[PDB]
Design a protein around this ligand. Structure first.
Ligand SMILES: *[C@@H]1O[C@H](CO)[C@@H](O)[C@H](O)[C@H]1NC(C)=O
Ligand SMILES: *[C@@H]1O[C@H](CO)[C@@H](O)[C@H](O)[C@H]1NC(C)=O
Ligand SMILES: *[C@@H]1O[C@H](CO)[C@@H](O)[C@H](O)[C@H]1NC(C)=O
Ligand SMILES: *[C@@H]1O[C@H](CO)[C@@H](O)[C@H](O)[C@H]1NC(C)=O
Ligand SMILES: *[C@@H]1O[C@H](CO)[C@@H](O)[C@H](O)[C@H]1NC(C)=O
Ligand SMILES: *[C@@H]1O[C@H](CO)[C@@H](O)[C@H](O)[C@H]1NC(C)=O
Ligand SMILES: [Ca+2]
Ligand SMILES: [Ca+2]
Ligand SMILES: [Ca+2]
Ligand SMILES: [Ca+2]
Ligand SMILES: [Ca+2]
Lengths: 1245, 191
């Protein structure tokens, strides 16, 4: 705080909350740390002065003048003419682009009490005396302008209020308290005595105790907090009187001990210890290849001289630090840049690990993830989740700052981690990892990048010629490439027409936009890697993009000007909502603390997509400005997020609206789960897992023990939640045998969402829209080859072979509560055999007659012709070869599997021998039994010699596919995303397409498809997908991928799933109000309203007791536009409130304005058409389309038949009742509701 | 009706905004102004920026000709946080668009009753209470606790007449306070 240069009496001496500089000639400059500045002149050079604020000639009008001496008509240019001479990249005097002017509608809220309230010239407002002292009209405009443009946070509010209060207090007029009533106070440290009047220049500790009194030290009072009582206010804080009090050598103030290098040459440590007031000084230095310099913070210190860079290409191609280029393929996780030993002299380990993964064709490896362990902390970055940060197994928000180290932030597309040491890591996904290693380390490094001894040849010599010696961990079968040994290496000749400019041609010597980088970085070695990618995968944009993008990024690192390199036709780039592409932009976008990172920023303009009119929040989502989350013990949490700051699930803290951390006390959860860290979240997770096996078509297995052979032929509810739980996920399982044991049309209902999984032929989950090849959401469905795997968000999984074989694995915390055909979770099958009413039915056929699923057609028959079909009972006694067939396959000498040793095959052997004897043999029954057991072993991966050998059982593939008992079809296939669980930790039977191939829902394409992979699903080429809420088009095209321009459905149609595909089509419910002022009712009818006023139109009038919510629409038929009686506003009286919509203005819920694209009340969607019409929809209810021109259509589903009764009439389909509801004439006047109708009773009286 | 001096009876209260005795509006602080134009105008609301547990209340009054074009209050829409309560002296009471019996409790802690004379009274616990006269005269009563918290046509409860009459507005606050939700468009009707 204090400093006296004494050269011309230059004394910077500051108060409690100021920074005051003083000179001989009365220059009074002070600066509050948060955008508050003051410059005062004592008539110094009154004749003239060059500056932005006046020439001090006593005339305000003459101030607007150029430095040249002429006046300026425009204030922008005039202000920009007074800039400091220097290089100014990305400095705009005004917002050249579209500036987000704040709306005029919400200015009322920002103007009323609670926001810039006392600032208004009101008598009752605090510090009302200052109104006479200073005219606050200019201050009033500033407050509202700042808050309206800003997000509305209270910080700017009281900042402006404090600025006005201090400015008006400097005149010497007393100020009353305002912070408490305004709600914004200061949590000052130490004594924290918030004084309305506090003595300026508070008591400090003079190092030599000999100084003059500053002029500003004698004057008026200042508001603020003082802790000078007790502890003296010294050393920029409040210190006990026996504090450091500076080092007072030459008058300089060095409080406490900062280990500050005295000399500028850094040769002497000289830590000033307050105990002895002496210099603990060492003539040594860091050495080790690093030398001291002036750091940007201001304190000089050691710094590495040179920085070396090792980069890992994308297919892979690895270069060394010394400068050696090599290329290999593999998938086992390896190390990277591992120090051989811990650095003896003040340096830590920095070893990194890299994993590799197979995407697309074989002999191709992509970088899966990179994990860095430094300073005892381990954090990882992976391509599977982009622009997100994972540390020590848990996800955190991106702006993660540790103390002086580990400053992780987001730079363009890349995410960058840097520490105190020179080691820095930059990762962007899609196979590009850049590691900057300082030369300060030793010349010997046991890393995959190689020792940096500056010799390329010695790189990778200890590891041997094979670059796979640096191996650690890894998968059990990583080394074994394929049953055919390490297939399809690309042609070394690389015979492709892909040397042309169109593909892999812009990278090297195309002139055009990429020419300037040729002199900077040699492009030949980058070019060579692009042709191998073109070789392995032919012309697919997904593989082609990473190579050229890596070249562009490596180019931009050195300062260069690059032209427009990517085009919609040639490798277009996608980005989430509220984000636009940028060829090169800000290197450090802002985070919740609205500033760039303290490290060097904006030094390079970086390729990537950035937000607009919103700031990056938590590394994603481009949240609207003014809605940051909360900061808690160094961790940033999104607003509304629920988390446990401590382990053991102690407290569930909530991120409050204005950053408050609202915390309560947790109950440590039920003793069936454990508070564990998995999937990046610490929470109580289930620890037990059971299985329910519906082996075969009719035979079932209880949850525990005895199997209950049931020969029913109808829909039966297998498992469902019987005792409701306040917190859980419900799921109902039903096996709809189509006809007399036909393959079941299985249906699952999880979290109120119906996932089909029904169409077992091929793979066709249908849920609601039958076209679901690969999909995610609440439920993830993965085509495990022939089998289909369904997984929930909570670990519940079920496998269906598609041929009437169900394996459910239920690990959820439903111990006891769950009940049904599988049974309760407990020790005995007897508990499973209990009935809901307790009446045990000895006949197993009677069991399930109560647990019968609906949807049966005209009843169903429960039983064989002769019940139990005893024909097979007698035959097997003389048919000992039938049991000899299956058993010999699964006997111990028969190497069918190793899982039968792990899990006894007795149940499946009994199933095989119990299958219909008349149908028994080596028939479909035997083949299905073997397939079912070998697909049930998939639960735990085991070596499994094929279940089918040669011609014994029949199986084939569409085309170009070979059969393998150990196949991982979940990855290495059509999709660029994976919902696999390691293929559920199983390589299984199925079809593996060869050479250049993809796998689109069974079919194989020679790698010319699957470029369209959206977040939801796999979009085949030349297809389209209309998403929810009439999201019109996400059309896929061969030339360009994912041109997802969205629009809305035209009038007279509703978005509803039809013929297994979701789009908008005409619906039966249609009541149009006044086309030419004529009302067409549900049934065909015509009538003119003939009189202005509000009239009810529809209502689910009582006496029917259906779950359709009470809806009461009204329409204010008013003159409005040219007295044409168009609909002006649509009041909708939902059971939980009133929703009002007007085409011109916004939407009102309960009397409050809301944003147009939002969901309100209970399941009510409100949206505005791009044309301007407004649409409101209710789930399973009415939806209203209000036209821009004033035309309203009411649409009702066909389900409501003669239930609603109103002006539009019933839905019975009879015109005579619909037109007149037992009323002689004019139903409109009868339907005029009196609530909103004006009295107008005897007005002329 | 509020407990005073340890005994429960009804006494005068500080909050008093009478709408149109002779068509003149007396605000919370003493003020006078004629509405001068038919239509619905907002009267009070706990406008945001204060964060007090008083529920969001938004009263409106359809000043309409009605009896001999005397601009008496005809109906009182009250926009409680959980719905709309509409009361008319002649007919019954509507909650969310459904008729209800006069002596009942509805929504959250909202008492509605009909006076033996014929006036209708609605009260909110720790909130506003409105008395709608049989002849068409409305009084809005607010507890003394709400001091300079509500802001509307009746103005603040600070106790200063100059701010209460004009809320930083030169003239005719009524037209400024005309809510557009229930106001008819009437835009270019003669066009
Ligand atoms: C001074 O500079 C301003 C801004 O460039 C220019 O408009 C003006 O004409 C200049 N005047 C003279 C005399 O050069
Ligand atoms: C990297 O350092 C961490 C520090 O604990 C160590 O556990 C890990 O094994 C090291 N990596 C390798 C590949 O040795
Ligand atoms: C399961 O068997 C045990 C052992 O006899 C018995 O105590 C228990 O009651 C049985 N379960 C039920 C639900 O009856
Ligand atoms: C998509 O575009 C046209 C549509 O008929 C066709 O010529 C082309 O072959 C289609 N693409 C594929 C992969 O079939
Ligand atoms: C008026 O009613 C008639 C009935 O035939 C029909 O033309 C239409 O539904 C309405 N509108 C116009 C513009 O005629
Ligand atoms: C009209 O305003 C005046 C204001 O002095 C006063 O008489 C009264 O409040 C209002 N009503 C009548 C009938 O005068
Ligand atoms: Ca001047
Ligand atoms: Ca070397
Ligand atoms: Ca049991
Ligand atoms: Ca009808
Ligand atoms: Ca007032």
């Amino acid at each position: 705080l204090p400093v006296y240069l004494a050269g011309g009496r230059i004394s910077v001496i500051n108060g409690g909350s100021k920074a005051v500089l003083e000179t001989d000639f009365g220059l009074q400059v002070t600066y509050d740390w948060n955008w508050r500045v003051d410059v005062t002149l004592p008539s110094s050079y009154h004749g003239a002065v060059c500056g932005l604020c006046g020439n001090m000639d006593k005339n305000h009008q003459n101030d607007q003048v150029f430095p040249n001496g002429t006046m300026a008509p425009s204030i922008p240019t005039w202000g920009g003419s007074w800039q400091v001479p220097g290089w100014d990249p990305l400095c705009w005097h005004e917002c050249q682009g579209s500036c987000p002017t704040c709306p005029e509608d919400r200015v009322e809220e920002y103007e009323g009490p609670g926001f810039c309230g006392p600032l208004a010239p009101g008598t009752g407002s605090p510090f009302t005396s200052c109104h006479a002292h200073v005219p606050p009209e200019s201050f009033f405009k500033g407050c509202v302008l700042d808050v309206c443009l800003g997000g509305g946070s209270k910080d700017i509010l009281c900042q402006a209020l404090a600025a006005y209060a201090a400015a008006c207090q400097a005149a010497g007029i007393k100020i009353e308290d305002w912070r408490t009533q305004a709600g914004c106070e200061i949590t000052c440290p130490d004594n924290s005595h918030y004084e309305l009047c506090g003595p300026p220049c508070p008591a400090s500790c003079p190092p030599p105790a000999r100084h003059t009194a500053p002029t500003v030290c004698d004057g008026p009072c200042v508001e603020g907090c003082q802790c000078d009582e007790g502890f003296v206010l010294s050393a920029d804080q409040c210190v006990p009187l026996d504090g450091g009090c500076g080092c007072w050598v030459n008058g300089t103030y060095y409080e406490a001990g900062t280990e500050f290098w005295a000399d500028t040459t850094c040769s002497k440590r000289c830590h000033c210890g307050p105990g002895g007031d002496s210099l603990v000084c060492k003539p040594a230095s860091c050495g080790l290849g690093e030398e001291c310099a002036l750091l940007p913070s201001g304190e000089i210190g050691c710094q590495p001289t040179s920085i070396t860079e090792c980069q890992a290409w994308g297919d892979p191609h690895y270069t060394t630090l010394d400068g050696h280029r090599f290329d290999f393929q593999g998938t086992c996780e390896y190390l990277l840049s591992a120090p051989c030993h811990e650095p003896p002299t003040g340096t830590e380990y920095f070893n990194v690990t890299v994993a590799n993964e197979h995407r697309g064709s074989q002999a191709v490896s992509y970088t899966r993830s990179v994990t860095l362990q430094i300073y005892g902390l381990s954090l990882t970055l992976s391509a599977q989740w982009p622009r997100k940060l994972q540390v020590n197994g848990e996800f955190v928000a991106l702006p993660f700052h540790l103390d002086q180290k580990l400053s992780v932030y987001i730079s363009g597309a890349d995410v960058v981690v840097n520490t105190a040491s020179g080691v820095s890591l930059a990762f962007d996904g899609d196979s590009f990892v850049r590691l900057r290693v300082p030369a300060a380390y030793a010349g010997t490094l046991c890393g995959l990048c190689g020792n940096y001894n500056k010799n390329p040849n010695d790189d990778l010599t200890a590891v041997g010629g094979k670059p796979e010696g640096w191996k650690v961990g890894g998968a059990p079968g990583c080394d074994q490439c394929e049953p055919e040994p390490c297939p399809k290496p690309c042609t070394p000749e690389e015979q492709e027409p892909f040397r042309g400019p169109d593909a892999c041609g812009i990278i090297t010597a195309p002139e055009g936009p990429l020419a300037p980088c040729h002199s900077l970085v040699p492009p030949t070695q980058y070019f060579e890697a692009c042709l191998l990618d073109a070789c392995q995968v032919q012309g697919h944009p997904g593989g082609l993009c990473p190579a050229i993008a890596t070249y562009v990024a490596a180019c931009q690192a050195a300062g260069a000007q690059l032209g427009e390199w990517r085009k919609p036709d040639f490798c277009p780039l996608q980005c989430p909502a509220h984000s636009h592409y940028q060829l090169c932009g800000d290197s450090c976008p802002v985070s919740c603390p609205s500033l760039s990172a303290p490290v060097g920023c904006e030094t390079i303009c970086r390729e990537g997509c950035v937000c607009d009119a919103g700031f990056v929040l938590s590394g994603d989502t481009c949240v609207p400005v003014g809605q940051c989350g909360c900061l808690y013990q160094g961790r940033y949490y999104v607003l509304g997020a629920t988390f446990y700051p401590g382990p053991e699930c102690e407290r569930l803290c909530e991120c409050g609206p204005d950053g408050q951390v609202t915390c309560q006390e947790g109950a440590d959860c039920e003793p069936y789960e454990e508070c564990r860290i998995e999937n990046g979240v610490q929470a109580c997770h289930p620890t037990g897992c059971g299985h329910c096996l519906a082996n075969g078509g009719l035979h079932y297995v209880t949850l525990d023990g005895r199997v209950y052979d049931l020969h029913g032929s109808c829909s039966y509810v297998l498992a469902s939640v019987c005792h409701p739980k306040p917190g859980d996920e419900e799921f109902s399982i039903v096996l709809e045998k189509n006809s007399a044991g036909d393959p079941q049309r299985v249906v699952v209902t999880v979290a109120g969402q119906v996932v089909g999984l029904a169409r077992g032929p091929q793979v066709t989950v249908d849920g609601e829209v039958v076209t679901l090849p690969v999909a995610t959401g609440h439920v993830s469905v993965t085509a495990e080859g022939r089998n289909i795997v369904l997984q929930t968000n909570k670990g519940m999984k079920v496998l269906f072979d598609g041929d009437a074989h169900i394996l459910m694995s239920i690990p959820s915390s439903f111990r006891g509560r769950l009940c049904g055909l599988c049974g309760n979770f407990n020790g005995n099958w007897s508990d499973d055999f209990v009935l809901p009413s307790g009446a045990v039915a000895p006949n197993v056929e009677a069991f399930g007659t109560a647990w019968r699923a609906p949807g049966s057609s005209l009843g169903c028959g429960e039983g064989c012709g002769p019940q139990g079909c005893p024909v097979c009972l007698a035959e097997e006694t003389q048919a000992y070869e039938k049991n000899d067939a299956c058993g010999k396959i699964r006997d111990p000498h028969g190497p069918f599997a190793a899982c039968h040793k792990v899990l006894s095959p007795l149940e499946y052997f009994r199933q095989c021998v119990y299958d219909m004897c008349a149908h028994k043999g080596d028939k479909a029954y035997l083949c299905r039994s073997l397939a079912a057991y070998t697909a049930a072993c998939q639960a735990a991966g085991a070596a499994v010699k094929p279940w089918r050998t040669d011609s014994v059982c029949p199986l084939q593939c569409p085309a170009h596919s070979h059969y393998s008992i150990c196949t991982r079809s979940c990855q290495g296939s059509c999709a660029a995303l994976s919902g696999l669980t390691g293929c559920t930790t199983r390589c299984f039977e199925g079809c593996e397409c060869d050479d250049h191939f993809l796998l689109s829902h069974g079919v194989c394409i020679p790698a010319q498809d699957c470029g369209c992979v959206h977040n939801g699903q796999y979009m085949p080429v030349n297809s389209s997908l209309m998403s929810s809420d009439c999201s019109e088009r996400c059309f896929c095209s061969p030339n360009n991928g994912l041109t997802c321009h969205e629009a809305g459905c035209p009038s007279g149609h509703v978005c509803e799933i039809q013929a297994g595909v979701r789009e908008c089509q005409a619906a039966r419910g249609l009541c149009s109000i006044s086309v030419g002022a004529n009302l067409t009712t549900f049934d065909g009818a015509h009538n003119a309203i003939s009189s202005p006023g509000v009239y009810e139109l529809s209502s689910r009038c009582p006496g029917l007791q259906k779950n359709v919510p009470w809806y009461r629409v009204l329409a204010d038929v008013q003159p409005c536009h040219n007295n044409d009686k168009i609909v002006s506003k649509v009041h909708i009286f939902f059971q939980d409130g009133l929703v009002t919509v007007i085409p011109s203005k916004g939407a009102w819920v309960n009397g409050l304005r809301v944003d147009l694209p939002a969901t309100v009340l209970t399941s009510v969607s409100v949206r505005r058409m791009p044309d301007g019409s407004m649409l409101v929809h209710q789930k399973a209810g009415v939806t209203v389309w209000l036209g821009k021109d004033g035309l309203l259509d009411v649409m009702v589903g066909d389900d409501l038949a003669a239930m609603l009764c109103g002006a539009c009439g019933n839905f019975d389909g009879d015109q005579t009742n619909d037109a007149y509801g037992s009323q002689g004439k004019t139903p409109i006047e009868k339907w005029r509701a009196q609530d909103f109708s004006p009295c107008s009773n005897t007005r002329t009286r």
